[PDB]
Amino acid sequence: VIKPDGPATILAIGTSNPTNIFEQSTYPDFFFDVTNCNDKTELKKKFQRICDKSGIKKRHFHLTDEILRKNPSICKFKEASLDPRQDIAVLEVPKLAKEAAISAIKQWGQPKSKITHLVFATTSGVDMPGADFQLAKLLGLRPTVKRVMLYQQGCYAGATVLRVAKDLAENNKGARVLVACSEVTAVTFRAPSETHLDGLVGSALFGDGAAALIVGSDPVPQEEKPLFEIHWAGEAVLPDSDGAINGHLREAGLIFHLLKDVPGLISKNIDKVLAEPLEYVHFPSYNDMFWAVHPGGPAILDQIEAKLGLSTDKMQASRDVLASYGNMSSASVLFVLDQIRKNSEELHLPTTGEGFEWGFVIGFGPGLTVETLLLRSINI
C-alpha cells in the first residue's frame, strides 16, 4: 500500500457570508425592535455597552426583519421555536457552504471530481441526511465521497475539521479533502432577557459565515498552489473547566451558558496547551510565529496576547475577522487563515504566514476544549 509522503497541505481557502449587513453600532436598535423589547430601555443600554465593547463593527446575517416576522417564535425567549429555526438552518447552512466551496474549488483550479473526502462542521442546527450530504449534493461531488459530519462541536470545530482532514489527506494517496465550516445564527438567536446575560453576549457576538478549504498531501507541481502545511494537530480539555461552555439543543433552540471565567481559563492554560507542538519544532519565539486564533470575543484575544507577551500585530488578523464578521463559530479561524495569506500576498511578504515560518490555528469551545494545530507557511 502506497501512502503519501508529505504533510496535509491547505491548497485553497474560500469564504462566504450572507448579503444582509448589520452594523454593530445600531444593532441594539434592530435587535430590540424585532424581538418587541423596545420597552426594556435598561436592558438596551446594557446591550449597547456589550456591542460597543465587542470589537465587532459589522456582522452578516441570513436572519432579517422579514424572516423573523414570518417566524415569530424565534423572537420569543423560551417559547417552542426549534422547528422554524431548523427549517431555516438546515437549508441555509449547506447553501452558504456551497458558495465558500465554489470559491475554494475555483482557487484550487482542479475539477470537483478529484475531491475524495468531505469534512463538514456546523453548530447551526442538525438534520439527517446531514449538511455534508447536502453540500455534496449541491456541488455534485462523486457519490462515493467519504464524509465526516461534525455536528454541534462549537467554536473549536474550525480546528477540528483540519485535524480530521490531516489524517484523511495523509493516509490516502491522491486524497483531496473538501473542508467546510458553515454557521447560520438561526438556532442561537435569543430574545433579550434581564435574566440571561449570556444571551446578550451571544446576541452581540455571533455572526454568520462559511469557510471552505481543500486539504491534500503531496501537491501536484505547477497545478496546485500550497498555502499552509499541517504538521501537528491535537487538543486539550483544560483543568478545572467543567461546565465552562455548555450548549443545549432544546425546544426553544440552542441555549448556551458561558461561565464568566472562560477567557481566564483559556489564558491561564494556553502556554501549557501549546507545549507539545512547540517542542516538536524546538520552542520558537511566540513573536516569530503567525496566529490564527478563534475570535470568540475581544477578552479571549486580549488575554492570550497579554499572557504570552505577543506584540499587537500578531492578533490583528483575528481582530480584523472579529471586526468584519463577528464570531462565526467554526468558520472564524479559517477566515483568519485566509486573511493571514491575503495580507501576505498583498504586502508581498516572504511567507504565506505574514513572513513567519511556524504558526498556530487555535479553536476554543465546550469542555473547555482548546483545539490546536501547528502550521508551516509556504515561501512566496
Identify which of 44, 9, 6 has the alpha carbon closest to the alpha carbon of residue 26: 44
260-289: which residues touch a copy of itself (CB under 8 A)? 276
221-224: Cβ within 8 A, 24+ apart: 223/109, 223/110, 224/11, 224/108, 224/109, 224/110
Residue 155: active-site member? yes
Residue carrying the nine cell digits 471565567: 261
Taking the complex as a whole, the smallest distance from the CB of residue 185 to a copy of itself amounts, in Å, to 15
> Smaller CB distance to a copy of itself: residue 9 or 86?
86
For position 126 contacting a copy of itself by CB under 8 A, the verdict is: yes
Residue 35: CB partners within 8 Å, gap ≥ 6? 75, 191, 192
For position 130 contacting a copy of itself by CB under 8 A, the verdict is: yes
d(CA 88, CA 186): 7
229 Rama class: left (phi>0) / alpha (psi -120 to 50) / beta: beta
> Smaller CB distance to a copy of itself: residue 235 or 302?
235
For position 327 contacting a copy of itself by CB under 8 A, the verdict is: no
Given the rule CB under 8 A, which of 99-107, 153-161, 284-292, 307-315 is the region that contacts a copy of itself?
153-161
Tell me, by CB under 8 A, how many residues bind a copy of itself.
57
For position 172 contacting a copy of itself by CB under 8 A, the verdict is: yes
* 281, 289 Cβ separation under 8 angstroms: no
For position 74 contacting a copy of itself by CB under 8 A, the verdict is: no
3-state DSSP call for residue 190?
coil
Cell numbers given for 142: 462523486
Burial of 123 (0-12, 13-18, 19+ CB in 10 A): buried
Residue of 37, 75, 155, 181 with catalytic role: 155
Residue of 52, 198, 235, 320 interacting with a copy of itself (CB under 8 A): 235
> Smaller CB distance to a copy of itself: residue 51 or 169?
169
Which residues contact a copy of itself (rule: CB under 8 A)? 1, 3, 7, 80, 82-83, 86, 123, 126-130, 133, 136-137, 143-154, 160, 163-164, 166-168, 170-172, 233-239, 245-251, 256, 276, 365-367, 369
> What are the catalytic residues?
155
